[PDB]
Amino acid sequence: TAGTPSGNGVDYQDDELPVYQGETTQSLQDYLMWQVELTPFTDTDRAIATSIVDAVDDTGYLTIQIEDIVDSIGDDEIGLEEVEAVLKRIQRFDPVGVAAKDLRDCLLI
Amino acid sequence: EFLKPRLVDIEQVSSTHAKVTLEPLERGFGHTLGNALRRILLSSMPGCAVTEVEIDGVLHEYSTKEGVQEDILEILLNLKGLAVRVQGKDEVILTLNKSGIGPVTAADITHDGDVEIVKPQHVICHLTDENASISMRIKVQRGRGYVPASTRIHSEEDERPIGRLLVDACYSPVERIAYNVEAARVEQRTDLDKLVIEMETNGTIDPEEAIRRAATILAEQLEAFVDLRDVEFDPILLRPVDDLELTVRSANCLKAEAIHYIGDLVQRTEVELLKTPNLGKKSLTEIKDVLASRGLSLGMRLENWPPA
Amino acid sequence: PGVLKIVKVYLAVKRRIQPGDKMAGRHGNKGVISKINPIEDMPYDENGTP
């Protein structure tokens, strides 16, 4: 070998009986649920927020329909009128434009 | 009822060494004027120092120049010791070009309009072959104390190009100060003291001018003791409430509930705002829908609410 | 076989002396810096050298 790359960074748990253990990582939904916990939401609002955050793809788009979100709740007084309000509140999060219905929604938000 | 010291017998040993005498002094005042003067003169005297350099080929400090004996870091450390005396300006640029053999010194710095090189035999660089040249631009500024190059950031407000050679600035022309109190030759008076001050500098500041500057600083500082006497912000808030484009029924309801600003509203919880007459479950979600597009959830908590 | 290109970058920094730093002589006398004192506060001799 004319040239050799430097060894990549590796680690292993020392002074611990279950060797190598593990490490937690932050994802898009994990970082979105963190913001949901720190905003003023009611119980039903928090439930709707979790429901629509679970449906966010890696791109951050909303793969499931709003009507399907309303169906998933299956709760009275949880029509699309308030699901939309919670959806807009979530769309106005740190990755601005996340959880958007389609491409037009991203640009408009 | 106290005698006042006079500036007499100022004698200059060398271009840097000098002696200053204050002939008439009372019993204890010798040290009070002295130690104060030493502290002022060692701490806060104005001067001029090299601030940054621009060599042709070199773009940083950890490089080398072909034909030059010393590294760029050593050249910058040499330039840090360059002593100049500018008049009427604070940002003179000292262009320097020299091609050939032998040490390069301030002497061969291009003769500026009003810039004095106190010692022209101060070497800064060495050339080692005939077909080599050095060309650099040196910026000199006026200041008061030690200003490290790393500690200053306002210079980075405008982006500096790759090729700058900034050096720490000291700005202090005084290197050593000693004072001593003797007995005055005045025989008519019972006993008087004489204060002699020895200052060693870099040749940039005059001794008498330095003493005058220190005394002026002391007087301005003492001016305070002569007569001691003495014995809801974020722009989205504080916005007109008719900026949310609410429905008709909300306008009277908000007016009825004395909601006139944006911040006061976001302080209202769902359960207590529902108690307002004819609010409407669907109309309440309309209020929340609009405030959600702004990013303003209901139930916030501000501390002080101004009338504006 | 996997590797297609390698790029190596070198950075240089200057470490300013600071109190939290550790100093020693060569007789077993170590210590950390507690304060960086202005020049007019240090003890000086009759010639004015601190």
Swiss-Prot record, chain B:
One of its GO terms (biological process) is regulation of DNA-templated transcription initiation. GO terms for molecular function: DNA binding; DNA-directed RNA polymerase activity; protein dimerization activity. The keyword Calcium does not apply. SUPFAM superfamilies: C-terminal domain of RNA polymerase alpha subunit, Insert subdomain of RNA polymerase alpha subunit, RBP11-like subunits of RNA polymerase. Transmembrane segments: none annotated. Its EC number is 2.7.7.6. The modification N6-acetyllysine is found at residues 281-282. It comes from the Bacteria. InterPro entries: DNA-dir_RNA_pol_insert, DNA-dir_RNA_pol_RpoA/D/Rpb3, DNA-dir_RpoA, RBP11-like, RNAP_asu_C, RNApol_insert_sf. Acetylated on Lys-281 and Lys-282 in the presence of glucose. PatZ controls acetylation of Lys-282 but not of Lys-281. Residues 1-229 are annotated as: Alpha N-terminal domain (alpha-NTD). The N-terminal domain is essential for RNAP assembly and basal transcription, whereas the C-terminal domain is involved in interaction with transcriptional regulators (such as CRP) and with upstream promoter elements. Homodimer. The RNAP catalytic core consists of 2 alpha, 1 beta, 1 beta' and 1 omega subunit. When a sigma factor is associated with the core the holoenzyme is formed, which can initiate transcription. Both the N- and C-terminus interact with different regions of transcriptional regulator CRP. The rRNA transcription and antitermination complex (rrnTAC) consists of RNAP, NusA, NusB, NusE (rpsJ), NusG, SubB, ribosomal protein S4, DNA and precursor rRNA; S4 is more flexible than other subunits. Belongs to the RNA polymerase alpha chain family. NCBIfam families: PRK05182.1-2, PRK05182.2-5, rpoA. DNA-dependent RNA polymerase (RNAP) catalyzes the transcription of DNA into RNA using the four ribonucleoside triphosphates as substrates. This subunit plays an important role in subunit assembly since its dimerization is the first step in the sequential assembly of subunits to form the holoenzyme. This is DNA-directed RNA polymerase subunit alpha. The lineage of its organism: Bacteria, Pseudomonadati, Pseudomonadota, Gammaproteobacteria, Enterobacterales.
UniProtKB/Swiss-Prot annotation, chain C:
This is DNA-directed RNA polymerase subunit beta. Belongs to the RNA polymerase beta chain family. It comes from the Bacteria. Acetylated on several lysine residues in the presence of glucose. Coiled coil: none annotated. The RNAP catalytic core consists of 2 alpha, 1 beta, 1 beta' and 1 omega subunit. When a sigma factor is associated with the core the holoenzyme is formed, which can initiate transcription. The rRNA transcription and antitermination complex (rrnTAC) consists of RNAP, NusA, NusB, NusE (rpsJ), NusG, SubB, ribosomal protein S4, DNA and precursor rRNA; S4 is more flexible than other subunits. In pull-down experiments interacts with CedA. (Microbial infection) Interacts (via flap domain) with Escherichia phage lambda antitermination protein Q; this interaction renders bacterial RNAP resistant to transcription pausing and allows it to read through termination signals. Co-administration of salinamide and rifampicin or salinamide and myxopyronin suppresses the emergence of resistance to both antibiotics. The gene is rpoB. DNA-dependent RNA polymerase (RNAP) catalyzes the transcription of DNA into RNA using the four ribonucleoside triphosphates as substrates. Transmembrane segments: none annotated.
